[PDB]
Symmetry: D2
Subunit: 343 residues, 4 copies
């Protein structure tokens, strides 16, 4: 039904394209294609990618970041801004109007992450692109990490840089770290390349090989994360013991319509509020038998978490990371622990 039609040739390119030196170039060639980008640059980590992006700016320039309220980031950026001598301004871009405002004559970069973690507020990338590009020379960067190039393609939505940061967690707990920066601009790529080779925040031939190896199945893995995610999200929202569910894949989401015109699907990241108190989120989490209590997100295994203990996030909110297990089993495990949290 509804989402942007999946990007053509993704799977074909992910498998055939290209099949630092050789290893890195091939990885980049292939990632460039999946991002619909003309160019790509690989870094040791998503963070190193981020730093390098900012090295693009000169002392004094202002950088406006999406405000990661409950999430972790923000301390970073702020530290990268401090050193290097830059001005950082965090603005909730959930409201396009707010971004229009914050734009200062010094603003040379706008960094956005969508969905957000763990509330999952979808930012209108296209909206921000037009607002940002409207005046002066400024860069729009989208951190596609939470969606992956398979479900979201920033560059196509007006972004100037689509950054993909993969941790030691997705292709199985495959300990491959990587910072992928894609772009179409000519100079942007040139400047970024120089930095890449000048500073050395680069990946090893092994990482590149492993990373590339894992991409081949990104499409089949992500589709299942989505089928399982959707299923879990529905079951929950229809469960008597769940106050609310937040999953970009459901129509109940406050941005479901923005989601269908920007993504081709959703991750296995499902958030939901459990009816009751922090004492109930407790019973629940402790009763899960198939889901695993972990603070990370991405494996083949379904993970659960209570951010409140892992004005603060409602201690009744739970973020799930639906993996590749059997949909039936996942639901039964959720059902069983919900019934336990309410005798």
């Amino acid at each position: 039904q509804g989402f942007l039609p999946h990007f053509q040739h993704f799977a074909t390119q992910a498998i055939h394209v290209g099949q630092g030196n050789p290893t890195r170039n091939c990885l980049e060639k292939a990632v460039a294609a999946l991002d619909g980008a003309k160019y790509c640059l690989a870094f040791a980590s998503g963070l190193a990618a981020t730093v390098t992006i900012t090295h693009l700016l000169k002392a004094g320039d202002q950088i406006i970041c999406m405000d990661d309220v409950y999430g972790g980031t923000n301390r970073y950026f702020r530290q990268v801004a401090s050193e290097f001598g830059l001005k950082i301004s965090f603005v909730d871009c959930s409201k396009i109007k707010l971004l229009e405002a914050a734009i200062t004559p010094e603003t040379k970069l706008v960094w956005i992450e969508t969905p957000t973690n763990p509330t999952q507020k979808v930012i209108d990338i296209e909206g921000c692109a037009h607002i940002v590009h409207k005046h002066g020379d400024i860069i729009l960067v989208v951190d596609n990490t939470f969606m992956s190039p398979y479900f979201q393609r920033p560059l196509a939505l007006g972004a100037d840089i689509s950054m993909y940061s993969a941790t030691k967690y997705m292709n199985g707990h495959s300990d491959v770290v990587m910072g992928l920066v894609s772009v179409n601009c000519e100079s942007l790529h040139n400047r970024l390349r120089f930095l890449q080779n000048s500073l050395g925040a680069v990946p090893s031939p092994i990482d590149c090989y492993l990373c590339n190896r894992g991409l081949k199945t990104l499409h089949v893995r992500m589709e299942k994360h989505f089928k399982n995610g959707m299923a879990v999200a529905q079951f929950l929202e229809s469960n008597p013991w769940v106050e609310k569910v937040i999953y970009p894949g459901l129509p109940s989401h406050p941005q479901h319509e923005l989601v269908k015109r920007q993504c081709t699907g959703c991750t296995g990241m499902v958030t939901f509020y459990i009816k009751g108190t922090l004492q109930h989120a407790e019973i629940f989490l402790k009763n899960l038998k198939l889901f695993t209590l972990a603070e990370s997100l991405g494996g083949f295994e379904s993970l659960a978490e209570l951010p409140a203990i892992m004005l603060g996030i409602s201690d009744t909110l739970i973020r799930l990371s639906v993996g590749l297990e059997d949909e039936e089993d996942l639901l039964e495990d959720l059902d069983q622990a919900l019934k336990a949290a309410h005798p």
Copy 2:
């Protein structure tokens, strides 16, 4: 669809079960579950597993084999029977009545591969089960390599032994070789275990680790193989340059009914006859730009082969091992090649 429903817990067991020593024991626990069996023993190669199974018999014993006409096998088995002094016999077990006639007092083992290669004749596991089990003490082994435990469960259909043999080709070109032998019978398992340890034809710890790792995405990869395989087979079947198609998933397959009540789905192996002459098949193969010419089967990559040059098999028969690329691109590559082979 009207195939058996997908095996319960498969994905969950593949990802969670278990997570010559350790590594092998966990691989064995896992595969045992995927085959719906109490036990499983791993060997160096499917060929090794085969030889091991024939060691359950003693000189003077007889063994019936599904007669693999155009495939490669038969020379093996024969070389194995010659040595070890066993009596071997080949029967077109696709004709159950014909197996009956073959049963003999010294018959103690019946080896069955299905679907055949590359004609894809399907054998009724159940039938042969009733027939074989009916009289005397005799083992019914099913080589589940061409289906994978995901789409077929020999043990649940009567077979005594389900042997899954994987080559250096699936899970990408992961160079892991392995022979897995799942079983339920108590003494059958004990004899097999004694043989396993006393003869040393076992995998290395790394192979077991790698093999188990691939098991975790087997369901999603097989699903995509099945999808692309169904698309390819339908497309070729309604194409003006195709005489006929041989694909278990299509209702046009002679034993499509058997399939549905014996498998949960189908592999990416699509067989078809190109309209024309050996020369047209050649034009077709040379024109393919997305498919890769090769004699192996199973990678993420789509392959094409002309058995006549790699009585005899028709010079018009082409076997494709459909990969995990974009259905669209595969369809267009074939269409382009077929059109090219007909000006």
Copy 3:
């Protein structure tokens, strides 16, 4: 001083030679060279190698094995002899005369291991070769595993088959299992090859690659095992708390002169008797702080063991597996625990 001069080009060949299919062939090419053999065959395990060797014989033939009294083997061989229908005769070949005797008109194979485990009695390979080859068509097989092709080259000493069986323990605890069979004969190689490809007790491309990878440093690793072994062996034999030492590298060994004309050095396997009772071997072993209590042998780490609890072996005997640690530290750790075993 004294031993046969090291085999020429070993290191060069181990690194350059060749730098189943490709992977296996290269591994075999290279191993053939290191064994000074014209040919080589790789199997899944040393045991699988052994079985395959015996498959060379026909029902009825007799196989004479070195008698592994305190060691583990013998149960194997005996089981392989049982099945397959062969006659096994275990004879202590420490006494060349004894082998001369046992030779039966049915004797078609003589299997020897030297040094022995854990007593380390050196067998005169050349002596047994002349005795064995003197009459009829019979095969002499030496299990070079305990020495490795770097310190001992059976084929050059008249052996017909030099078998090297590497476990998941040497190139670091590199979990690579492998059975290497080398030979110069034309037919022996032919028959063995057939068996190799007919039965499938073969290694995976990964194993072959890893195994080959590790060979490159075999010379430097083994030399240090020897320097450390020699040092440890001396310190011990000169220690007031040690009744006796048995290390082919010392002149005190009852075969030190046979050793210098058959090997180019020694392993890190040092055996020794601790002055006192099983209660003292206890105190000793329990006080080691750098050596590790393990029943295996081969890592980069120095291992200790008391075979009596790991007419039976004197419960006062200890086998060490000297690794690659600093010689000084190894001695100090031995010294410290010996002083503890005798307050």
Copy 4:
């Protein structure tokens, strides 16, 4: 020999110590010990480590570098100083008096590589230590890449920071890249740690695992490099076709005395001038049959390079990166090539 005695416990620590998370922390504990330092921080590449170290300084600060004339470096450093706005200066620190003159109020960092490449000029770590430390607050960093922590311990000789940067070339052609920064000073370590985590130029868990794994055989490999290196250098030095040799291990090296009181041994990098013309050097290189032509250094494989084509370096200067092959074969290959370059 008259070199410093070999570092105590090195091999033992390399094999036992430790056996961004785990993997990296253990690599860091290990390398910290090998460098005889309290701490060590790992980065993506030696180049990344370098950039990180320069981040300890702020705009307006100055940094002195051993002037690498014929090597490659200098362009880096300069590109790093240009950006980040630092003042850089190059000094032939092999002439201690010349460094003194260079010290400035804004001087806060002195970078020293030794021996140089490919001339192999040796810098007195200690001297520069006394000189630099003498006045003001300034850091003395030593790039220990060309020696390895096995043959040189910068920190024990006065240096504040010892940076070991390994490429995809040693430990065989193990494609592991890494930059290790060992240190003793408390605040120096804390600032470095903050930078490490806040900027993300870190290794992946697999690189750390692989890197630590190679550390375990570093002593034995370096010893063989040193041996072969000594042999090669002596042989070339007494050969009729060699003008002169430049090898730290030979008493003919201008700073052979410094060496002995600063290193425990030498690398396999032997530099020498072929008697004759650029054309003779060419004949030599083309005739080599065992040595491999390459611009990298460090594998198990022996390499040869002619810097003049890969003021200016003499067209007669040849640098060899001596591997772990048989000394005999290396000597004969060189001799064969030299003879060939002189009819």
